[PDB]
Design a protein around this ligand. Structure first.
Ligand SMILES: [Mg+2]
Ligand SMILES: [Zn+2]
Length: 329
């Protein structure tokens, strides 16, 4: 009843769980492709969420394994490893000094649970592809945040499988509040909402208030949920802020997934989506564009909100940006 030698190496890697730049791909290999299960378990133990919400440990493990099984192993980017990465990145962002004692246990549970379910059952093609092909998913969700609606529906539906209801001991009031927050967070992961989220985060930085203790003041639901939505959005767009050996693995995976969508579009004579044409691609120029127009404006605004807690993350982002610029053919 002590861990095997593979289990010990996994445990030593999981000591980095509170650090930006966790070896998540190594944890995926060591856990037998269970990165989301072991990282969620570690985070739930670390934050004492099993005791606070009276979650039976067997129910937690059964749900986490079920959730992880509904991420597609054949999808190169939007898989259980990406879910695990966004969970661990949200975990680190929640621990930022400028947010110490700001958020309740329920809000923390919401942000982490939202991160874990936020891409579940992703088929490895975009909303636009599902809409243009008249897919069943697009029909059910009236072409509106199709994947993000689906992620939420599956994440909640899986609570009803045998010994999977991790919220069985929460009051109705707790469950209604958790549910609304998880829905507001995951629907905010739709990139179509990015510009509005960023405008609202900028507006909050301009009218920012801190207590005499130096920590962010958020006294209404609108402001608290906006910060959690931008936090998980930041975790979702965190690849270019990681050490370059990690960023480059994520870039290889997203480009594999985009090129596979491009191949499916070309074989069916559909217009090939941006960045999805493997015969007409500038991976390096794309990353510099993504950083310049999307990732840097978001993380620059986040860094202002929690000044100076995010300086080393913003510095890594600017270094990764210069590295991709310097490799443009
Ligand atoms: Mg998504
Ligand atoms: Zn995602």
């Amino acid at each position: 009843g002590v861990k095997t030698e593979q289990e010990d190496v996994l445990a030593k890697e999981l000591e980095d769980v509170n650090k930006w730049g966790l070896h998540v791909f190594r944890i995926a290999e060591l856990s037998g492709n269970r990165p989301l299960t072991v990282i969620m378990h570690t985070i739930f133990q670390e934050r004492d969420l099993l005791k606070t919400f009276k979650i039976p440990v067997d129910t937690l493990i059964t749900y986490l394994m079920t959730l992880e099984d509904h991420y597609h192993a054949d999808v190169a980017y939007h898989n259980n490893i990406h879910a695990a990465d966004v969970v661990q990145s949200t975990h680190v962002l929640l621990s930022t000094p400028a947010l110490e004692a700001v958020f309740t246990d329920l809000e923390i549970l919401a942000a982490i649970f939202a991160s874990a379910i936020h891409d579940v059952d992703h088929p490895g093609v975009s909303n636009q592809f599902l809409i243009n092909t008249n897919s069943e998913l697009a029909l059910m969700y009236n072409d509106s945040s199709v994947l993000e609606n689906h992620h939420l529906a599956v994440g909640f539906k899986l609570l009803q499988e045998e010994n999977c209801d991790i919220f069985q001991n929460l009051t109705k009031k707790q469950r209604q509040s958790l549910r609304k927050m998880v829905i507001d967070i995951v629907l905010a992961t739709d990139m179509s909402k990015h510009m509005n989220l960023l405008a609202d985060l900028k507006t909050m930085v301009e009218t920012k208030k801190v207590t005499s203790s130096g920590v962010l003041l958020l006294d209404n639901y609108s402001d608290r949920i906006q910060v959690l939505q931008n936090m998980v959005h930041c975790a979702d767009l965190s690849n270019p802020t990681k050490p370059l050996q990690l960023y480059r693995q994520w870039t290889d995976r997203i480009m594999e997934e985009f090129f596979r969508q491009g191949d499916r579009e070309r074989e069916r004579g559909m217009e090939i989506s941006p960045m999805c044409d493997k015969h007409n691609a500038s991976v390096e120029k794309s990353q510099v564009g993504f950083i310049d127009y999307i990732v840097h404006p978001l993380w620059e605004t986040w860094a202002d909100l929690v000044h100076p807690d995010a300086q080393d993350i913003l510095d890594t982002l600017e270094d990764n940006r210069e590295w991709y610029q310097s490799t443009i053919p």
